[PDB]
């Protein structure tokens, strides 16, 4: 009766389906997969990448960046929603091959430094290669690259370092406020009385209100289905996309129902 | 045509077969599995653990330590042969649950800090939870716990930070010199002209001579089969065990044959 | 006209005046200096140290711990108020010589990992040897050592990771609720519109209310003068000590006056 | 009788005397001070900086890089001789302000990660802000930036991670082999029987032979006086410069004399 073997982190095949760069605004591009968002913001002084997806997506990301005329040495900054394997997986490999830096808050940095191990809910089940953060950012801090300002909005819940990023881009001259809001889900979490996260419910509640008040004309999420995006229908991907209010209100309804079922 | 899924690190079932603590000397015990060595040295001022095996062995290690009258808070120091998943796997979990410290050289420390990721030969294929080293030790440095001196002997090759540990114990009063020598294998390595390890062959050659000159009456290895140990036959486990000269000489014969076949 | 020389971190001589262990409760002791608090909590399963003072106090701390019958290997856990040189200075040296672990939140951990460098207000002016945290704790998390529960209460302001610790001890059988509240000062900080700390005022306001609602019968602070302690008059040190309400209310009056003067 | 105050790291005024960029080859420049070497190698795909000097030199380095038409975002890689405060001081500040990466061996990385604290000989007396290495390099490894190959040559002694860098540049078309060899001194070290460095003498001896066999037409050192450079007389700075053989032979004569005097 030997000990169990190690189990790999397996995801749906749609999370790993490569796609060509889909344009979101004049400078913003989706270069991830069909069910995983990886945003590229091209500026005059370099490129900014938000999230990266699964650890085995680093090659596909460099391929799409090459398609957009972005050399590896042109990636300046990597920003993250939260440091889980399905969103910050290839961060370590992308740092070695691009010369980019990583900016994240303290909670995302310490989780990223241990490769997502010792998770508050998942333990060591979802482990990815570790990476270090080069710049620690605070709530409301502005990160500027090539004349584009990225404002961080802390929204703890899914992870203690969950962060929504807001920036203003154009769409044929007309400005558009983009809000890349992190996930507001809690799959299988113990919500009430968690010894590892004593103030989990209070953080989620404050994060719901944080998402509602985000300056947003167009909303994106790490998982495109969370905001009703569909990267498969390229030009009509943002057809039935939710607002910031509709996204936070829908997430809280599932949170209260899950919280009430946990008490039973 | 989606990207490939992540693949888990799977080993032979004999590597994960738990075993009761097998005694090696008056203070040294084997508390790992049948095919993975994990040594416990009980002193008057605490316990010392050398290696830990696979990442899913932390519970079994604490079980055997409990059998030897060693509380979790009694583990003082964790020493390592080399920082691969099949030998330093549970180091991170053991640090959280025992209050122990880790002593290793700089090369083992940096590899352990990134959880074995970005390996010089294996890449990210063999990843385990990361852990940090608390004390950096040099070649020939002595680590003393409870009146027992542990001397480090650098033997780079399998990893840049491969280390053999020598200490003197007793066997019913009579002293015995124990040498825990690291692995001298190179499974599937590119030996000649490796860009990641330009001086690999020269390090192996110097390590062969380092193992031959080790003060040793009884030899152990991370994999017991490498030194002809058989943990299954408890009392007769050290029956046909190799000397330090026979172990290094046998490893070099396989190295030259592998090196010559690589040139063809 | 050469560049300026490096300037050392110099403090008042009263901050470095060694003192004998002054008892606070049945298990709590002050073993720091006259103007720097360093608390030792002796339990049945080991000792807990809160803060350490200046970096050159590690020897004095080990001397006082020896006076209390606490061996170096008996220090199990180091807790911190905030990671500045005058309170977490000797943490690195104490870890090497005691085999203890450090528990702190993510913000204190990342600041401690870079030795207090790149401070949000002080820059590199107050640098101390770096140390790594072994356990990351959340707001409201309980840390138990030897049957004594230490509850963390986040109170950001002086530093992003400022933490107040509450635990219940006895005084000749009768229980006493002790609250070790961090500093609520802001010496020379830019309060409004700080690019490195955009939500500084809002964090201070929430920290004032956090301190008022602390379960507390006896209050201590990293600097004893902040809570009207006087370690010099040993038995009557806690004579005119402030409550939690009086301490937070007095700190906010100075914060509003400083905030109003900054606007002028 | 209070504890002693912290003492700052003070150096000679000539170590902090700023100087204009002095040219060494077609792509190599000295942009440090008169008595501290900081080399800038301008390539078509970015700039490479070797060492930085004292921690308070980051501003002067960026000033000279601006004079050479090198923007902060054009610094790609920082290489180091050894990680002491007088040579890797501003590395942390330069990483925050340039977007560059650091490549160093494991021994230099772990020393740089703790800001030079816990030195094998100096203790905590020479502390500088900590920085992390992004790429770990081995002995003989080649680092290529903009078509220029930088080969690492390990020469342990002054520090365990001391490294000499060799690269080929031109001087009006004609190629020149440049060897930036680390310091071979040992000021006040205990050479024989050092518990922190048991194989110190053997490392120095092997480093002497490593320096003699360096491919070198022009030799530079972290301290220019060690190789008889004089940055003050700009055009004639390399007048009486030593060869690699003359530098290693002169260093070993002082090592044997110091070693013999230590035995007395
Ligand atoms: C770690 O990755 C996740 N979890 C899993 O894949 C497994 C472990 C699972 O929850 O069944 C995780 O969190 N995600 C999110 C999110 O919204 O962020 C959702 C909705 C679920 O998928 C990913
Ligand atoms: C990473 O673990 C090892 N490698 C593997 O498990 C796979 C990847 C394999 O080599 O086929 C590794 O190294 N070991 C040793 C050793 O002697 O250390 C030997 C002999 C082979 O097994 C383990
Ligand atoms: C970094 O140490 C401090 N600052 C200084 O020593 C200098 C830099 C200064 O502020 O003039 C700091 O913060 N302290 C506190 C506190 O309340 O924590 C107070 C009240 C002032 O003293 C220490
Ligand atoms: C830490 O910096 C050094 N040491 C000092 O400044 C003091 C502590 C001193 O040794 O008196 C150090 O090493 N250097 C070297 C070198 O060759 O690297 C030499 C020759 C001496 O100066 C610097
Ligand atoms: Zn997630
Ligand atoms: Zn997810
Ligand atoms: Zn191995
Ligand atoms: Zn192995
Ligand atoms: Zn402070
Ligand atoms: Zn203070
Ligand atoms: Zn030096
Ligand atoms: Zn020097």
């Amino acid at each position: 009766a030997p000990l169990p073997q190690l189990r790999a982190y397996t995801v749906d095949a749609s999370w790993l389906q490569p796609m060509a760069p889909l344009q979101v605004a004049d400078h913003t591009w989706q270069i991830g997969t069909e069910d995983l968002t990886a945003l590229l913001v091209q500026t005059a002084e370099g490129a900014v990448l938000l999230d990266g997806g699964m650890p085995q997506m680093a090659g596909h990301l460099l391929d799409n960046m090459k398609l957009r005329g972005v050399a590896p040495q042109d990636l300046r900054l990597i920003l993250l929603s939260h440091a889980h394997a399905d969103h910050a997986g290839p961060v370590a490999e992308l740092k070695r091959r691009t010369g980019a830096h990583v900016a994240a808050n303290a909670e995302t940095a310490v989780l990223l430094a241990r490769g997502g191990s010792n998770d508050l809910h998942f333990g060591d089940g979802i482990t990815y290669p570790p990476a270090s953060a080069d710049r620690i950012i605070m709530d409301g801090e502005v990160v500027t690259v090539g004349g584009i300002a990225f404002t961080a909005h802390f929204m703890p819940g899914h992870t203690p370092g969950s962060t929504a990023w807001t920036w203003t881009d154009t769409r044929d001259g007309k400005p558009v406020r983009i809000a890349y809001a992190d996930s507001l889900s809690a799959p299988g979490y113990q919500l009430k009385g968690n010894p590892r996260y004593p103030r989990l419910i209070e953080d989620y509640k404050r994060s719901f209100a944080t998402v509602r008040a985000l300056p947003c004309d167009l909303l994106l999420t790490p998982h495109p289905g969370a905001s009703n995006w569909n990267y498969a229908v390229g030009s009509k991907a943002s057809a039935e996309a939710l607002t910031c209010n509709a996204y936070a209100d829908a997430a809280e309804k599932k949170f209260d129902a899950q919280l009430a079922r946990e008490t039973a």
Side-chain angles (χ1 to χ4, degrees), chain A:
Chain A
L3 294 165
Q5 296 279 356
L6 287 178
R7 194 207 75 263
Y9 178 48
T10 49
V11 302
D12 279 325
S14 51
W15 289 21
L16 299 166
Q17 190 65 41
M19 62 172 297
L22 160 64
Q23 200 179 9
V24 184
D26 284 355
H27 302 339
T28 302
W29 291 82
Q30 153 66 10
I31 62 175
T33 56
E34 298 189 6
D35 276 357
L36 284 181
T37 300
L39 296 176
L40 185 67
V41 179
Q42 298 194 238
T43 81
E45 289 169 275
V48 179
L49 180 74
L50 295 90
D51 288 1
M54 293 290 293
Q56 60 270 40
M57 286 178 52
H60 170 71
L61 295 180
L62 292 173
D63 275 359
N64 279 342
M65 288 165 56
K66 176 69 175 304
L67 286 178
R68 301 262 67 257
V70 184
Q73 49 276 2
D74 291 332
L75 192 67
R76 302 295 174 176
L77 187 75
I78 298 180
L79 300 175
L80 296 177
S81 57
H82 68 272
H84 273 167
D86 64 322
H87 307 290
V91 169
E93 184 176 340
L94 287 176
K95 284 194 63 176
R96 296 193 302 263
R97 305 177 61 183
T98 60
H101 281 196
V102 170
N105 55 29
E107 290 278 16
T108 302
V110 295
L111 184 62
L112 185 71
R114 59 182 195 248
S117 67
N118 195 27
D119 192 80
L120 303 183
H121 307 270
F122 301 148
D124 293 335
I126 325 293
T127 298
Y128 63 95
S132 66
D134 307 292
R135 176 181 174 182
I136 301 298
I137 52 98
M138 296 290 300
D139 198 11
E141 192 170 342
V142 181
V143 189
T144 295
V145 177
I148 300 184
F150 295 89
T151 302
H153 309 263
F154 288 3
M155 42 170 296
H158 196 69
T159 63
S162 287
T163 294
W165 292 95
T166 59
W167 75 92
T168 299
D169 201 3
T170 52
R171 292 204 294 184
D172 191 62
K174 294 185 176 59
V176 49
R177 293 168 298 170
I178 299 179
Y180 184 59
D182 201 342
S183 311
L184 282 175
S185 66
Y189 292 4
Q190 185 200 337
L191 302 187
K192 198 210 305 297
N194 196 323
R196 301 291 303 279
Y197 205 159
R199 312 246 294 187
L200 180 148
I201 302 178
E202 308 166 43
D203 277 349
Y204 268 96
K205 286 295 181 177
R206 192 182 304 104
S207 297
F208 298 144
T210 304
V211 174
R212 294 191 181 101
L214 282 179
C216 174
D217 300 323
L218 195 60
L219 173 77
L220 290 84
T221 53
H223 297 281
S227 54
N228 259 273
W229 277 74
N230 185 223
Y231 294 155
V233 289
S235 190
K236 290 216 158 303
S238 67
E240 319 190 72
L242 305 172
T243 65
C244 267
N245 282 272
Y247 170 64
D249 175 77
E252 187 166 10
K253 293 188 188 304
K254 311 176 185 179
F255 187 83
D256 301 329
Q258 171 182 343
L259 178 58
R261 287 262 171 253
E262 176 172 321
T263 63

